[PDB]
Amino acid sequence: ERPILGRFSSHLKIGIVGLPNVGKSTFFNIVTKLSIPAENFPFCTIDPNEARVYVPDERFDWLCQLYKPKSEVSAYLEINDIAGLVRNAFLSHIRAVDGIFHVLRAFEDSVDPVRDLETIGEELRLKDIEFVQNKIDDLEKSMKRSNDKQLKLEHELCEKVKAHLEDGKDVRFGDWKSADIEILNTFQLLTAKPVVYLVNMSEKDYQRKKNKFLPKIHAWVQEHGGETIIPFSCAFERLLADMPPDEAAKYCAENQIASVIPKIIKTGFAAIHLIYFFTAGPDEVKCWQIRRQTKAPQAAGTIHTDFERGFICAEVMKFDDLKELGSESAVKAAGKYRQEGKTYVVQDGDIIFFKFN
Numbered sequence: 001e002r003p004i005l006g007r008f009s010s011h012l013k014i015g016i017v018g019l020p021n022v023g024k025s026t027f028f029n030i031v032t033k034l035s036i037p038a039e040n041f042p043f044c045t046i047d048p049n050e051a052r053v054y055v056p057d058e059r060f061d062w063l064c065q066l067y068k069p070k071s072e073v074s075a076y077l078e079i080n081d082i083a084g085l086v087r088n089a090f091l092s093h094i095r096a097v098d099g100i101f102h103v104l105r106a107f108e109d110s111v112d113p114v115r116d117l118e119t120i121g122e123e124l125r126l127k128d129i130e131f132v133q134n135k136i137d138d139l140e141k142s143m144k145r146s147n148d149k150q151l152k153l154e155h156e157l158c159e160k161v162k163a164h165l166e167d168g169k170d171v172r173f174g175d176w177k178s179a180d181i182e183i184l185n186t187f188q189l190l191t192a193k194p195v196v197y198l199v200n201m202s203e204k205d206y207q208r209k210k211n212k213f214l215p216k217i218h219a220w221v222q223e224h225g226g227e228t229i230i231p232f233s234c235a236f237e238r239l240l241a242d243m244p245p246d247e248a249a250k251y252c253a254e255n256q257i258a259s260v261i262p263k264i265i266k267t268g269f270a271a272i273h274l275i276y277f278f279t280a281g282p283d284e285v286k287c288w289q290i291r292r293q294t295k296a297p298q299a300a301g302t303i304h305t306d307f308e309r310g311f312i313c314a315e316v317m318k319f320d321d322l323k324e325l326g327s328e329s330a331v332k333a334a335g336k337y338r339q340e341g342k343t344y345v346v347q348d349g350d351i352i353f354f355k356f357n
């Protein structure tokens with residue numbers, strides 16, 4: 001696997017992006033009404049357009065109804081509400097996020113989501129060209145007075161990126177080398193950011209799993225990267241959120257309909273190349289956010305630096321093996337507990353105990 005095109009951090013954000021009045025803030029408000037209170041993040045300053053929501057996980061809940069810890073800690077997704085494009089402070093708001101929830105209109109009050117996919121598409125490609133051109137101009141000036149091998153390599157990349165963007169293609173869909181990605185991460189280009197398509201439609205359409213605009217959207221996406229498309233009804237989700245659990249479950253069974261907000265949160269979290277491992281014990285069961293392609297020692301460090309500095313090994317059992325057999329004791333008895341070294345890339349769902357010092 002090649003290195004991942006993304007910002008070097010685990011404090012990642014996802015931004016709600018789309019044309020005016022497509023249901024962005026309604027979606028955000030449904031998110032907020034289901035968000036973790038701001039005071040739970042004392043190290044942070046959470047703006048009114050920001051929200052942090054828990055990531056649901058069926059493995060995590062199984063690890064609770066088998067351990068009953070003192071504290072249960074889920075992972076979270078940070079979502080940022082950006083206003084609609086009317087043309088920016090819009091482009092500087094996208095610069096602050098790492099992935100995109102691309103919200104599309106597919107409901108009747110010209111309704112053309114494919115056009116909107118091109119409209120946002122162009123606006124993002126063009127803004128990237130402005131960034132890349134400004135770099136080429138800056139690199140060329142420096143090369144007149146310097147002979148650093150890096151200045152040529154960066155210029156060479158920029159020019160390849162410039163031609164890629166001008167051909168209508170997005171940065172994240174180019175075939176880049178390792179050293180190419182490392183420099184691209186230094187730019188954090190707009191069309192490098194992964195997207196999830198959230199197609200907003202009427203409750204009726206969403207319920208009967210049929211929409212007139214979807215086959216076209218689907219055909220376009222397949223021709224432009226093949227990223228995930230989630231159909232959803234903003235109105236319906238709004239209506240369900242304002243209900244108490246009692247009525248909400250009754251409304252769902254009676255209308256044969258179900259919320260997709262969980263899947264949205266789960267897909268957003270995965271989209272921005274975040275995964276988590278578990279530490280399961282009788283005192284704590286916690287999902288530990290890490291970036292995909294993190295090695296075992298670095299994963300140890302996020303819990304406590306001693307774990308990384310003194311790293312001996314990571315004792316990892318797979319969830320399925322714990323599920324099939326009895327418990328931790330039963331798993332060790334069968335000898336499933338793999339002892340993985342410094343070179344081991346942590347896989348999502350790994351239940352880990354670290355050995356150090």
Ligand SMILES: Nc1nc2c(ncn2[C@@H]2O[C@H](COP(=O)(O)OP(=O)(O)NP(=O)(O)O)[C@@H](O)[C@H]2O)c(=O)[nH]1
Pocket residue numbers: 019020021022023024025026027082083084085107108109200201202233234235
């Ligand atoms: N029929 C219908 N109307 C919607 C839907 N979502 C949004 N709207 C309309 O759009 C208006 C604004 O709602 P909002 O969720 O803020 O949309 P927005 O995309 O955040 N607008 P902005 O681009 O200014 O941030 C609402 O008053 C409503 O009339 C929808 O799913 N169905």
Ligand SMILES: [Mg+2]
Pocket residue numbers: 024025026081082083084
């Ligand atoms: Mg809004």
